């Protein structure tokens, strides 16, 4: 069905813009609360082209020890969503935290595009 690149865009891209309720709404609408409350998830508020370009930027080790992760040279506008301590599926609750940080994504395929959000720094 959904490609890895498409799933990345679904789980991590929001070029369209946050408020205190952003994560509650967004995690729901992007289907990250379907089977489980996804504990941690980041949305990137840059253009797709800008985020895709990260796959030709600074090559860094992935957290899992693979070598196909890439760090943005520039900081990017992001929102971190983190499940609260009182969150209970299926009413998943998140704290919304905006920041401007370098992103690290894993890239794969031809074309070579982001498939996983690894970290922000
Ligand atoms: O800063 C972070 C750290 C992890 N993640 C999430 O991204 C997950 C990696 O899975 P994927 O990007 O393939 O959905 C990771 O395990 C965590 O759930 C973020 O979005 N941002």
Swiss-Prot record:
This is Ribonuclease pancreatic. One of its GO terms (cellular component) is extracellular region. GO terms for molecular function: lyase activity; nucleic acid binding; ribonuclease A activity; RNA nuclease activity. The gene is RNASE1. Interacts with and forms tight 1:1 complexes with RNH1. Dimerization of two such complexes may occur. Interaction with RNH1 inhibits this protein. Monomer. Endonuclease that catalyzes the cleavage of RNA on the 3' side of pyrimidine nucleotides. Acts on single-stranded and double-stranded RNA. Changing residue 12 to A: Loss of activity. Changing residue 116 to A: Loss of activity. Disulfide bonds join 23-81, 37-92, 55-107, 62-69. It comes from the Eukaryota. The active site is at residues 12, 116. Glycans are attached at residues 1, 7, 31, 34, 38. It is found in: Secreted. The keyword Repeat does not apply. GO terms for biological process: defense response to Gram-positive bacterium. Pancreas. It comes from Bos taurus. The chain holds residues 27 to 150 of 150 of the full protein. Its EC number is 4.6.1.18. Belongs to the pancreatic ribonuclease family. Keywords: Disulfide bond, Endonuclease, Glycation, Glycoprotein, Hydrolase, Lyase, Nuclease, Secreted, Signal. It catalyses: an [RNA] containing cytidine + H2O = an [RNA]-3'-cytidine-3'-phosphate + a 5'-hydroxy-ribonucleotide-3'-[RNA]; an [RNA] containing uridine + H2O = an [RNA]-3'-uridine-3'-phosphate + a 5'-hydroxy-ribonucleotide-3'-[RNA]. It is an enzyme of class 4 (lyase). Substrate binds at residues 7, 10, 38-42, 63, 82.
């Amino acid at each position: 069905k959904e490609t890895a690149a498409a799933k990345f865009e679904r789980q991590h891209m929001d070029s369209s813009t946050s408020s205190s309720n952003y994560c509650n709404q967004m995690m729901k609408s992007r289907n990250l609360t379907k089977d489980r409350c996804k504990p941690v998830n980041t949305f990137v508020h840059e253009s797709l082209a800008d985020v895709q370009a990260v796959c030709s930027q600074k090559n860094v080790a992935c957290k899992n020890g693979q070598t196909n992760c890439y760090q943005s040279y520039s900081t990017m506008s992001i929102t971190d969503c983190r499940e609260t301590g009182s969150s209970k599926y299926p009413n998943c609750a998140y704290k919304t935290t905006q920041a401007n940080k370098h992103i690290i994504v894993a890239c794969e395929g031809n074309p070579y595009v982001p498939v996983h959000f690894d970290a922000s720094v």
